[PDB]
Structures are given as structure tokens and as C-alpha cells.
């Protein structure tokens, strides 16, 4: 693990993330760092247009241009959908459309705002010397005031946090198949589910943060996208980059690494009862960061952790193979539960949806040993 992106203490998180961009781009960081007012009094389209177009050079190291895409992304969601009640815009301006799409294609992402964005790299911690706690942390962009955005983010955040302790026993995991060690491999199976249970539990304090009511009206209004939106049929045009309307989705809330990480981790196949439920976690990968991908990809160029499992007999084993396997379960099977309460309750005043993820949570657990 090096060219992956992945940090022993936060994980797919981008460590210590930058707040500040060098000053050559001011303009940008004044207009993201004031969306709340600006959207509220309706000054916000009117600054984004008369802005001027600043080169991407000047963002040399890989922070300053997530950086970046975090400014530019958000006052993207902020021009085009405003105060959320009908007055769309279909055409982003050159001036902010260029850099943010020549910024999208160095770090190959989609030009619009994504969960590497708006979570993973959107946070700082209030004293460097206390822990990762919500009581210590906060986030660098938020939308419009009461938006619940400082909940929905950093909670999203601290479950990618808790994860990361069992993504670093990862390499022990292969090094002990490697070496046959079993019982370095059954401790660290075991580390996993634990540390996945804890994960669990982290994503309960979502209740703590974040207001059903105040996510559906607004927060995911700013979330939201223009792949198969009504609102948007034909896609956003990016003045000057494309001529043509292009169409991206909006899927921050369901673009973690996390839930695909340990699924290629025991070689859970996600197709084993889906026909387009593999096509699906196959497009999230596309809105995740190359490295992620990549990470993902390599992982299942390592020697299988199942077919190691199943090929001794070892009832400890199995036992612990079996443990990470419902941990995962546990993990998207809360998670329906926080669809239900966020989306589905609110959305009364879909369910297409919620099989899609019943797919994938079921082949998950029909993956189990016992
Ligand atoms: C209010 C909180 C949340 C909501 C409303 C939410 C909503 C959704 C939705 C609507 C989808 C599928 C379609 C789409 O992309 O729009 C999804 C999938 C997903 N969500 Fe969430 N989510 C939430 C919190 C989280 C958190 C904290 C994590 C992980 C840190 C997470 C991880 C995922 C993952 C990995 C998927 C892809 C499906 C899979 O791999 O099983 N979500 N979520």
C-alpha cells in the first residue's frame, strides 16, 4: 500500500486536507466560502458570472487541486440549482466551467461534486492535538444554513475513519496466507469484523447530527445531479469545454469505497442474482478517485482470501470468515434503514431503489460459509 491512497489512521480520507488554496484564487474561495449567504440573498449566480477565468497551473500538489475541486464543486451545485424551486440553470459559465473540468480531467473525476469532495476531503480538525471526534471536528464547505451538511459529512466521514482500522490489517491478512500463518490470519479476520462492528455503531451517530427533513429539502438538493433528472433531460452544458450537454450523476451519498472494499476483500461477487445490480457499483467506481479504483482492482489481484478459507476445513476460520461477512451485512443492511428514514419518510409529500440495494445485500449474505 502507497500508490492507493489509503492512510493508516483515516483511510480512503484524505489525511489533513488543505484549507486553503494558494491565494491566486482568492475569488474562488470567497465565493464557496460564503455560499450560504450568497445563496440565501440570490447574489450567488450573479458572482459566479462575473468572474473571471483563472488557469489551473498554479495547483501544483494534489491537495490544492482536491482543494480545488471542492471549491469549484460546490459553487457548481450552488449555480445550478439555487434556492431549489424551479429556477434551474441548464449552461455552466466558461469562467468557472473550464478550470473545473480541466481540474476534473488531471484527477479523473467527473466534473461535478462527489463524495471524495464533499467528504473526504472537506474536513479539519478544531484542536490538532484532541482526537477525531465530531466534538472536534468540522468541515471546510457547507450549503445554505441548517442544511444539516456538517452532520451528513463529518458522520459520513468517522465511519470512513472507523473503517480504516480494518483496512490496515489488509496486508496481514495476505501475509500470513502467504506464510501460512493461520493463526495470524484468524485474529486478523477477526480484527476486521470487529473493527467493522465499530463502524456499525459510528454510523448510528448519523441521528445525532442530521434532520430527515432538512436533508431531503435541502441538503440533497445541492447533492443531487443531472444523469435521468427531469429537470435537467439533456445533461449541463459546460460553456467552452463541450458544445454538447453532458450528463453526470449526483450519487455522493452513495459513493464510499468502503462497502466494495471488503467485498473484493472475501470475494463477494455482486452479480450472483443481479442483472443490474453489478452495472451499478460498477458506475460508482467511475465517481470514486483513480487510486481507489485502482486499489480495488489490485486488491483482486491478490490470491483469494475465500478460496484459502474454504480449501483447510478449519471450522475457526470459517467461523471468523463468516463474522466479517455478516459485518458487512450489518453494515448495508443499517444503512437501508438510514434510506428509509432520510429518503423513503421524507419522500412523502424510490422504491427501485431499495431493491437495488436489497440486491446487493442479500448476494452478500447468501455469500456466507454456514
Ligand atoms: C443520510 C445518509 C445516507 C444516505 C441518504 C444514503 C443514500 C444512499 C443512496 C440513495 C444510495 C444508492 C443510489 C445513489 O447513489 O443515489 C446509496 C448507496 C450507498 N451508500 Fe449511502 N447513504 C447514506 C450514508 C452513507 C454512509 C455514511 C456510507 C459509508 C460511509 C454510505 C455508503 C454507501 C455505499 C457504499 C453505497 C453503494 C451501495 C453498496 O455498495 O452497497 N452511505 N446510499
Redesign the pocket.
Known amino acids: 500500500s502507497k500508490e492507493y491512497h489509503i492512510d493508516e489512521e483515516v483511510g480512503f480520507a484524505l489525511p489533513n486536507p488543505q484549507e486553503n488554496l494558494p491565494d491566486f484564487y482568492n475569488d474562488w474561495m470567497f465565493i464557496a466560502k460564503h455560499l450560504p449567504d450568497l445563496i440565501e440573498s440570490g447574489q450567488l449566480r450573479e458572482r459566479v458570472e462575473k468572474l473571471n477565468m483563472l488557469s489551473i497551473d498554479h495547483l501544483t500538489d494534489h491537495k490544492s487541486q482536491r482543494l480545488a475541486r471542492l471549491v469549484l464543486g460546490c459553487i457548481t451545485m450552488a449555480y445550478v440549482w439555487g434556492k431549489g424551486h424551479g429556477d434551474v440553470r441548464k449552461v455552466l459559465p466558461r469562467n468557472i466551467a473550464v478550470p473545473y473540468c480541466q481540474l476534473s480531467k488531471k484527477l479523473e473525476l467527473p466534473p461535478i461534486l462527489v463524495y471524495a469532495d464533499c467528504?473526504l476531503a472537506n474536513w479539519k480538525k478544531k484542536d490538532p492535538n484532541k482526537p477525531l471526534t465530531y466534538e472536534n471536528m468540522d468541515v471546510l464547505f457547507s450549503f445554505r444554513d441548517g442544511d444539516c451538511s456538517k452532520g451528513?459529512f463529518l458522520?459520513?466521514?468517522l465511519?470512513?475513519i472507523a473503517?480504516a482500522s480494518a483496512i490496515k490489517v489488509i496486508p496481514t491478512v495476505f501475509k500470513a496466507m502467504q506464510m501460512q500463518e493461520r493463526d495470524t490470519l484468524l485474529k486478523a479476520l477477526l480484527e476486521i469484523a470487529s473493527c467493522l462492528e465499530k463502524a456499525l455503531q459510528v454510523?448510528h451517530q448519523?441521528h445525532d447530527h442530521?434532520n430527515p427533513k432538512a436533508?431531503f429539502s435541502v441538503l440533497?438538493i445541492y447533492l443531487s445531479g443531472w444523469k435521468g433528472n427531469p429537470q435537467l433531460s439533456d445533461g449541463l452544458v459546460y460553456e467552452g469545454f463541450w458544445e454538447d450537454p453532458k450528463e453526470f450523476?449526483?450519487?455522493?451519498?452513495?459513493?464510499?469505497?468502503?462497502?466494495?472494499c471488503f467485498?473484493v476483500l472475501l470475494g463477494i461477487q455482486q452479480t450472483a442474482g443481479g442483472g443490474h445490480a453489478a452495472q451499478?457499483?460498477q458506475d460508482?467506481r467511475r465517481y470514486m478517485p483513480p487510486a481507489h479504483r485502482n486499489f480495488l482492482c489490485s486488491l483482486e489481484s491478490n490470491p483469494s482470501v475465500r478460496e484459502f478459507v474454504l480449501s483447510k476445513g478449519d471450522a475457526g476460520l470459517r467461523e471468523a470468515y463468516d463474522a466479517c461477512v455478516k459485518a458487512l451485512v450489518s453494515?448495508?443492511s443499517y444503512?437501508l434503514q438510514?434510506?428509509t428514514?432520510?429518503?423513503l419518510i421524507p419522500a412523502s409529500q424510490g422504491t427501485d431503489?431499495m431493491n437495488?440495494?436489497k440486491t446487493?445485500?442479500s448476494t452478500?449474505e447468501k455469500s456466507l460459509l454456514k
Open positions: 467528504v451528513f458522520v459520513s466521514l465511519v470512513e473503517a454510523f448519523i442530521v436533508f440533497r450523476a449526483g450519487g455522493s451519498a452513495g459513493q464510499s469505497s468502503v462497502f466494495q467485498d451499478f457499483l460508482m453494515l448495508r444503512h438510514i434510506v428514514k432520510y429518503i431503489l437495488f440495494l446487493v445485500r452478500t
